[PDB]
Scaffold this active site. Structure first.
Site, short mmCIF file in Angstrom:
data_model
loop_
_atom_site.label_atom_id
_atom_site.label_comp_id
_atom_site.label_asym_id
_atom_site.label_seq_id
_atom_site.Cartn_x
_atom_site.Cartn_y
_atom_site.Cartn_z
N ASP A 297 80.13 -9.38 -8.39
CA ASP A 297 79.19 -9.24 -9.51
C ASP A 297 78.14 -10.35 -9.53
O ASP A 297 78.39 -11.44 -10.06
CB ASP A 297 79.97 -9.21 -10.81
CG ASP A 297 79.15 -8.91 -12.01
OD1 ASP A 297 77.90 -8.80 -11.85
OD2 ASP A 297 79.81 -8.69 -13.06
N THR A 298 76.94 -10.05 -9.00
CA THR A 298 75.84 -11.02 -8.99
C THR A 298 75.32 -11.37 -10.37
O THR A 298 74.67 -12.38 -10.53
CB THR A 298 74.72 -10.53 -8.10
OG1 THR A 298 74.22 -9.29 -8.61
CG2 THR A 298 75.17 -10.36 -6.69
N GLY A 299 75.60 -10.54 -11.39
CA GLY A 299 75.15 -10.82 -12.75
C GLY A 299 76.13 -11.66 -13.53
O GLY A 299 75.88 -11.92 -14.72
#
Ligand code: 4UY
Lengths: 99, 99
Positions: free
Chosen positions: A25-27
């Site tokens: 999850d880059t967010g």
């Protein structure tokens, strides 16, 4: 690997001797795992997202194997609806977004 | 580009002629934008995240530029803490995760 994003980027992790499925999850700034036991000291923390905030336990200096790549860092434990590998561990396995 | 994850993967988007900042989010199925006016009819959607559900307005076939890349697709509007580009549009710009 190269992971396309047609489907959720789910991988197997090993944490605390346990295998779990987790979302890359880059967010997410931080890594959040569903309720489990981890060693050592912890401190309480609040983490916010869509919906609001949840209370978690912050454990520092935890080793995780992420799709076969070892990484050390902070792991937050609490009532997340999905196990999330966040940027604090994605950087350690060398993950990048490319387009 | 190649976007490392030591900082948040924030990019400029253009929607409705306006520039906004948004987070490239591999953990998001859907793209969610802060309250703004979009054309056409909307449909209802509930979106669940770490700390519960929010109600959003679903607009289809919206033109949006993401870091210079043109996309045309679904945008959810509602009380997101940050503008999020989710996988529905990351696939249109050809984004992958690599390690
Ligand atoms: C199930 N529905 C969700 C999945 O797809 C939909 O798209 C939007 C929404 O997705 C999410 O909320 N995704 C979560 C990650 C996620 C994924 C799934 C459930 C919960 C959370 C996201 O990737 C990471 N988060 C924040 C963004 C919302 C800014 S977060 O989980 O709240 C988070 C916040 C702070 C963290 O560290 C400080 C670590 C993680 C919807």
């Amino acid at each position: 690997p190269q992971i396309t994003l047609w489907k959720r980027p789910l991988v197997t992790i090993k944490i605390g001797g346990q295998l779990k499925e987790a979302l890359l999850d880059t967010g997410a700034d931080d890594t959040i795992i569903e309720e489990m036991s981890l060693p050592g000291r912890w401190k309480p923390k609040m983490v916010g997202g869509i919906g609001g905030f949840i209370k978690v336990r912050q454990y520092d200096q935890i080793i995780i194997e992420i799709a076969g790549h070892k990484a050390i860092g902070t792991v937050l434990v609490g009532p997340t609806p999905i196990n999330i590998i966040g940027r604090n561990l994605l950087t350690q396995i060398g993950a990048t977004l490319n387009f």
